[PDB]
From Swiss-Prot, chains A, B:
The chain holds residues 22 to 91 of 91 of the full protein. One of its GO terms (biological process) is signal transduction. It comes from Oryctolagus cuniculus (Rabbit). Synthesized in the uterus and lung. Induction: By progesterone. GO terms for molecular function: phospholipase A2 inhibitor activity; steroid binding. Keywords: Disulfide bond, Lipid-binding, Phospholipase A2 inhibitor, Secreted, Signal, Steroid-binding. Transmembrane segments: none annotated. Antiparallel homodimer; disulfide-linked. Interaction with LMBR1L is controversial. It is found in: Secreted. Belongs to the secretoglobin family. GO terms for cellular component: cytoplasm; extracellular space. This is Uteroglobin.
Length: 70, 70
């Protein structure tokens, strides 16, 4: 159950840059309060190692593409 | 919209307790590295103030509800 625009956002959160991510945000027209919150989130997740983030990517893939999501 | 099994992970990761959340990851039988990264995510997320979290939750919610997705 890959909604692509959503997968775009999630891939930027984990692997992108803060800018890349703020940019995914805007076609959804998030609120002032929603957009601060998303960036606060980006801040803490980027404090993890890049292999870490990556594996989280791998875990995510594993769920949206699992039998149970088809 | 969103695969319900996966909306159930998003919810324990922003709003549950760590054990709710690890349980929810084990039901997919993630390998250990995958799982440990999963756990590292909840660890760092748990430094956010509950309305930040609530705000990430609404944002997720608007995205999947968009005409862009669903």
């Amino acid at each position: 159950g890959i909604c692509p625009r959503f997968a775009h956002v999630i891939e930027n959160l984990l692997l992108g840059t803060p800018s890349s991510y703020e940019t995914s945000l805007k076609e959804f027209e998030p609120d002032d309060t929603m957009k601060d919150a998303g960036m606060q989130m980006k801040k803490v997740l980027d404090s993890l190692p890049q292999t870490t983030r990556e594996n989280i990517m791998k875990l995510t893939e594993k769920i949206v593409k699992s039998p149970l999501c088809m």
